Specification:
The structure is cut from a larger assembly and holds chains A (90 residues), B (120 residues), C (197 residues), D (545 residues), E (76 residues) and F (65 residues). By secondary structure, chain D is of the alpha+beta class. Chain D is built from 14 helices and 31 strands. Chain D starts with a helix and ends with a strand. Chain E has one domain. Classes of the chains: A mainly alpha (90), B mainly alpha (120), C mainly alpha (197), D alpha+beta (545), E mainly alpha (76), F mainly beta (65). Chain D: One of its GO terms (biological process) is regulation of transcription by RNA polymerase II. Chain D: It is found in: Nucleus.
Chain lengths: 90, 120, 197, 545, 76, 65
């Protein structure tokens, strides 16, 4: 039960996103805060998604580090199957 | 702006007097998202027909093949009136007098022992 | 396949390991089926590798849906109470059963009050007239039938002596649950009608 | 044909405005349906330029009450734009009813049976019904009172069915007509303390004006979208835009959940206290928040036994919350679309929910599937209200019609047209004889139910009338709208008179029927409730705006 | 006229789970979903073929509708 | 963004993009961290008052005039 062990360790762990903010967007969708550790695992999963996109974008920036531009998010999300849109109207 | 001043006239032609300032910014974000998925599919359909210029029949094809999937509608009146008369013919059931809390079968309700992990 | 890190690639590869942790359409009626819809567009004949390509396309449509409804039909077959890493938090079904028991007790108290009224009306000798007589007559017929049944059960006793693999089942809920989540068939007349089947 | 539609319509426009003034006001009714049926037939046959020219030439001679429909039509220029609208698709296939008198129909048929205008006569007898009554031609301010809907001003043959509009215990239905639930000893104990409240009930009338106690939601930065109060003023529910239902106790008695199943197994039943024994005092708040909707809760409805809160939301589900365990019990998934309203029956077993999918379903809290589908509206079923005998369901809607539906057979027995905007409030008289409806035009129209005739028009409010209720006696109708006012109307002087012309001459008496107007501080009156001692309760989020 | 014979659908379930039984309602709805898929795919593929000015309905037309509207990517 | 597969976010609103016409279009990544977060406002409460006392509107601060 590796993940059951991890969730049991998640008590005493503070995630990068607060549980007052992760729990707010969970309450908005009907998910109510029965257990803090479950909120913390959801927060960590969201963090991993954003972090993986960011790291792929950094490999693209290093290939072309420093500033993150929309032309770095565009090929980074293209392997994810997500076509990001430029603003172009402001 | 140019395209943002036309967006305030589409809302005012629909009688929307009061709106948030972020309303114009994200209808332009949807209008940009919608035209860069018609024209993206239009050159896919142009390369299928093997022509170097994306002409008006490609955009006619890419509009009606995106409107066949994206923008749906509620069910029509001849469909709603057929499932009504199929349902309204069945007579109302009688009620058991002291059954208790009147609920559906337990696989259709949200009443389960509803477990949680032991903190250790 | 166009996306190397595609997100539905990791879905159906981890879904299969979740189900491991617990069509080939007929070529002769399909070829008539494609050609009749082709009359409405002017597509009078079809390529010989298409009627087996649509059959391979219909298979990967339903196998992507059979695998999807199997991982939610096994979601209900996970019994937490055999494991003791989990703890029960709120049994509302038991509270509803207790409310039903309270309603049954109220019904029994009403029946006892009716029985007391029947015992009172037994002594009917023109005292309370119609009401006492009506209650006594209805009670007497029921009492006589009950007495006969007890007596016939005693008669039966003497005559009697003389004489002597968990199969996971997919409901329509598991199919409906896998229709309102995907983008196709979320606002469709086939899911809308399925709410009434 | 299509290039001369501006010659057919302008010829009939020239005939009607050149008529005498008695028949001119009644013959102006077929300007709007002939404008739309000619415009929608142009855009369905792919004649866009001609359609655009027709719209520009004739849109401004249409009655002012039709601007919203006219704007939706101005957007519709293509065929495929209209093939997915489903409201103009049902307008093109239905027939406009167009109630006209026989004195004006003789002038119309003497201008259409001739070959000079056999094309506009062909459009009339294809797309328009004409329902003829023998009587006086109506005035312009009487025709203005009863038109306004799409496929509107329905036939008198629809409003002639026998409606059992009387209360239960020659217009009352039998008790075994609709299989209503039993009356338990705890439900019989409720009516014993209900008639103690009726002892202190004041007669309101036009002299003893009631006191209004406004229960404002102060912070409410999640938008409040639904309020309900129990029949005794003890609970107040709030449906909010952050997908929550919040129950407040207003009496000095905190909200308690019942004990868990381990605690109930050790106590005994058959005790007199029983309910008192079961309450948990460890859980006792003045506020209980209910989570589980994935969208803004739009409907909120208590059950008459003060358990069983109901809530409907944008996610397409109706939810039955217990008020003894304060959890969710059932999720009723029949709509795929936003359920705009729900209400329990006044006997508490059935409930009706109306949604964006243009039907209203009848549920029973025992089946996962509905029992009756009320599927005759052409737009969203905004409101759903039960009759006081619960044999009839009134469903107001966004196509400017109110329809009564019999619970047996699912048949529409009444069609009430005459609103200019989407109906956002319905209420029944406690007699069961009358029905008050409010909409976005600020008009409160009082309808008879036995005669199927509107009996009055209350036109004091400015913005959308979002809450109506009659008194407990029936003496006063209270109206609350978005102009932050609670207007009180004399609901006895409005029903002092009780046909075959299918209409009555409405009195223009709103000024005499207004007992008072009370303005809220920047607060739209979302709910109106009448205490059993005839005290007005009102709830609305305070929005500084 | 029926293109899916209701027994090969049961072999599509046996390959996923050797111990699983659908309900008759579920099987009939699955057959309706299959029929609807065949119809929509063929109509749009035929729209692409008329667009390519053809009377042949070659797979390129069926393969393009899967990739753009359904994201199937069946090997051709 | 638009996700062709649609499985990571299925009809889930991300609240739009806080973008402007007069924006700077480039910020420093530690400017967003060091700014103080806005105060979460008060939760919804239920207060009662009186619109009308037997026909007359009182001049309490919960009433307009």
């Amino acid at each position: 039960t590796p993940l059951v062990d991890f969730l049991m360790q998640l008590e005493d762990y503070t995630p990068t996103i607060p549980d007052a903010v992760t729990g707010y967007y969970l309450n908005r969708a009907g998910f109510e805060a029965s257990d803090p550790r479950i909120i913390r695992l959801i927060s960590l999963a969201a963090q991993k998604f954003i972090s993986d996109i960011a790291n792929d974008a950094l490999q693209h920036c290093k290939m072309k580090k420093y500033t993150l531009t929309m032309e770095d998010l565009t090929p980074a999300l293209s392997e994810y199957g997500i076509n990001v849109k430029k603003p172009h109207y402001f | 702006p140019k395209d943002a001043q036309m967006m305030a006239q589409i809302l005012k032609d629909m009688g929307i007097t009061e709106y948030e300032p972020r309303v114009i910014n994200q209808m332009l974000e949807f209008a940009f998202r919608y035209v860069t998925t018609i024209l993206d599919d239009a050159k896919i359909y142009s390369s299928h027909a093997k022509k170097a210029t994306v002409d008006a029949d490609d955009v006619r094809l890419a509009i009606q093949c995106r409107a066949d999937q994206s923008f749906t509608s509620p069910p029509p009146r001849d469909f709603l009136l057929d499932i009504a008369r199929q349902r309204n013919q069945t007579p109302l059931p009688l009620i058991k007098p002291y059954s208790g809390p009147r609920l559906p079968p337990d696989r259709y309700c949200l009443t389960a022992p509803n477990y949680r992990l032991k903190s250790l | 396949v166009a996306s190397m890190a595609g997100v539905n690639l990791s879905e159906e590869s981890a879904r299969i390991l979740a189900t491991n942790s617990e069509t080939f359409l007929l070529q002769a009626p399909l070829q008539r089926r494609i050609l009749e819809i082709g009359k409405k567009h002017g597509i009078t004949e079809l390529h010989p590798d298409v009627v087996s390509y649509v059959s391979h396309a219909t298979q990967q449509r339903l196998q992507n849906l059979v695998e999807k409804i199997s991982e939610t039909a096994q979601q209900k077959n996970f019994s937490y109470k055999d494991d003791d890493r989990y703890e029960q938090a709120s049994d509302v079904r038991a509270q509803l059963k207790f409310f039903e028991q309270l309603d049954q007790i109220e019904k029994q108290r009403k029946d006892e009050q009716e029985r007391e009224i029947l015992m009172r009306a037994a002594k009917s000798r023109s005292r309370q007239e119609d009401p006492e007589q009506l209650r006594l007559k209805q009670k007497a017929k029921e009492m006589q039938q009950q007495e006969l049944a007890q007596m016939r059960q005693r008669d039966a006793n003497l005559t009697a002596l003389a004489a002597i693999q968990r199969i996971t089942r997919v409901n329509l809920r598991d199919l409906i649950f896998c229709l309102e989540n995907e983008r196709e068939t979320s606002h469709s007349l086939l899911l809308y009608k399925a709410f009434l089947k | 044909d299509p290039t001369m539609y501006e010659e057919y319509y302008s010829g009939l426009k020239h005939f009607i405005e050149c008529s005498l003034d008695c028949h001119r006001a009644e013959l102006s009714q077929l300007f709007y349906p002939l404008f739309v049926h000619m415009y929608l037939e142009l855009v369905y046959n792919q004649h866009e330029n001609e359609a655009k020219s027709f719209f520009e030439k004739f849109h401004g001679d249409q009655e002012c009450y039709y601007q919203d429909d006219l704007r939706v039509l101005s957007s519709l220029t293509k065929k495929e734009h209209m093939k997915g609208n489903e409201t103009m698709l049902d307008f093109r296939t239905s027939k406009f009813v167009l109630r006209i008198s026989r004195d004006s129909y003789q002038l119309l048929k003497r201008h259409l049976q001739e070959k000079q205008n056999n094309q506009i006569w062909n459009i009339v007898q294809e797309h328009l019904y004409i329902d003829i009554f023998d009587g006086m031609p109506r005035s312009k301010q009487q025709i203005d009172a009863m038109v306004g809907s799409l496929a509107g001003e329905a036939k008198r043959e629809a409003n002639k069915s026998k409606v059992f509009f009387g209360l239960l215990k020659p217009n009352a239905p039998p008790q075994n007509r609709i299989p209503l639930p039993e009356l338990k000893d705890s439900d019989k104990l409720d009516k014993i303390m209900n008639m103690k409240e009726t002892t202190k009930r004041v007669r309101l009338g036009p002299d003893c004006l009631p006191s209004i106690c406004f229960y404002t939601f102060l912070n409410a930065y999640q938008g409040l979208t639904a309020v309900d109060v129990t029949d005794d003023s003890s609970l107040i529910a709030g449906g909010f835009a952050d997908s929550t239902v919040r129950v407040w106790s207003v009496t000095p008695k905190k909200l308690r959940s019942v004990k868990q199943a381990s605690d109930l197994s050790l106590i005994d039943k058959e005790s007199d206290d029983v309910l008192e024994r079961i309450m948990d005092e460890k859980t006792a708040s003045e506020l209980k928040i209910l989570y589980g909707h994935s969208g803004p809760v739009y409907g909120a409805s208590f059950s008459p036994d003060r358990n069983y809160l109901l809530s409907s939301s944008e996610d397409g589900t109706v939810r039955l919350w217990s008020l003894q365990t304060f959890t969710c019990l059932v999720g009723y998934k029949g709509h795929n679309y936003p359920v705009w309203d729900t209400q329990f029956s006044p006997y508490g077993y059935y409930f009706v929910s109306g949604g964006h999918d243009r039907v209203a379903r009848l549920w029973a809290t025992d089946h996962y599937q509905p029992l009756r589908i009320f599927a005759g509206h052409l737009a969203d079923v905004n409101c759903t209200r039960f009759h006081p005998n619960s044999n009839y369901v009134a469903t107001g809607s966004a196509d400017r019609t109110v329809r009564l539906w019999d619970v047996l057979n699912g048949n529409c027995v009444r069609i009430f047209t005459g609103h200019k905007g989407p109906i956002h409030s319905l209420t029944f008289s406690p007699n069961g004889r009358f029905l008050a409806t409010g909409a976005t035009d600020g008009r409160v129209l009082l309808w008879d139910i036995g005669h199927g005739l509107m009996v009055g028009e209350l036109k004091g409010h400015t913005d959308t009338v979002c809450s109506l209720r009659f008194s407990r006696d029936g003496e006063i109708l209270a109206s609350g709208s978005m102009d932050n006012t609670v207007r009180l109307w004399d609901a006895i002087k409005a029903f002092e008179d009780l046909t075959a012309t299918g209409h009555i001459n409405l009195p223009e008496n709103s000024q005499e029927l207004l007992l008072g107007t009370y303005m809220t501080k920047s607060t739209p009156v979302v709910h109106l409730h009448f205490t059993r001692r005839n005290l007005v309760l009102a709830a609305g989020a305070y929005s500084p705006q | 006229n029926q293109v899916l014979t209701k027994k090969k659908l049961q072999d599509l379930v046996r390959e996923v789970d050797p111990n699983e039984q659908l309900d008759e309602d579920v099987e009939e709805m699955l057959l309706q979903i299959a029929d609807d898929f065949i119809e929509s795919v063929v109509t749009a593929a035929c729209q692409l073929a008329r667009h390519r000015k053809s009377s042949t309905l070659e797979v390129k037309d069926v393969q393009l509708h899967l990739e753009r509207q359904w994201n199937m990517w069946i090997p051709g | 963004f638009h996700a062709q597969e649609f499985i990571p976010f299925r009809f889930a609103s991300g609240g739009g993009r806080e973008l402007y016409f007069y924006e700077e279009k480039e910020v420093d990544l530690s400017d967003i961290i060091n700014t103080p977060l806005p105060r979460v406002p008060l939760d919804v409460c239920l207060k009662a008052h009186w619109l009308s006392i037997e026909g007359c509107q009182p001049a309490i601060p919960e009433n307009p005039p």
